[PDB]
């Protein structure tokens, strides 16, 4: 049995190294990572890898790792794949814990835009979770938390995190993680996987995939949303991604909206994440 060294960036930024037989399917590595993390609610999570075009791909647990990573390194990230619309219903605190680590990265990276006040509030909950109750001994007027809270840090933001931290006295890590998630779940880009595309006129858009449906971001005005119940079916062919939308009652025929993706692999990738979200959130 020939075994391959696997490296996995965990959500705390640490690197986990393990081995799998070279012929292993993605599920084998995923199960090893989840056992290491003491994670039982595995369905929300997955491993990503970077293809030869440097695009993020989900490692398919059903297929050989080698037939996915192909010419690239056996280097992976552990990530939230399906963001729960209601994290309060997750059965385990440890699940909510990893969801918080993913969301913190979503915020710092800028993938999850956030108001000044909401950056401070989320930050205050993270601090309550990681440090416990406010202590003025590790917070002079000039205090600068080691915690990354935002894509751009200001002293005003650092001061607001501290002021809000003061109000959370007695709050346990589990409680602060729950408060974190009840706020984060309401942000407009929460759980939205964005894909660059052009519409049929060739205009640059973004297609969002999430629990509630598809979003077409033309700009900020007339965002255009298709709830899963409105979507009749989905397909790719070559560079193209097609969405069939139900007719209104007594409208006779479904409509087709077509998009141009950068390449065929981008079209398939989008198709696949749409199918996966549709199955997951039709059921959940
Ligand atoms: C996968 C899917 C999503 Cl994502 C959303 C709505 C419908 C479907 N189904 C299909 O596209 C086809 C046609 C019937 C069976 O599969």
Curated annotation (Swiss-Prot):
<comment type="function">
    <text>Tumor suppressor that inhibits cell proliferation and promotes apoptosis. Modulates the activity of protein arginine N-methyltransferases, including PRMT3 and PRMT5.</text>
</comment>
<feature type="domain" description="FERM">
    <location>
        <begin position="4"/>
        <end position="284"/>
    </location>
</feature>
<comment type="subunit">
    <text>Interacts (via FERM domain) with CADM1. Interacts (via FERM domain) with PRMT3; the interaction is direct and inhibits the protein-arginine N-methyltransferase activity of PRMT3. Interacts with PRMT5. Interacts with PRMT6.</text>
</comment>
<protein>
    <recommendedName>
        <fullName>Band 4.1-like protein 3</fullName>
    </recommendedName>
</protein>
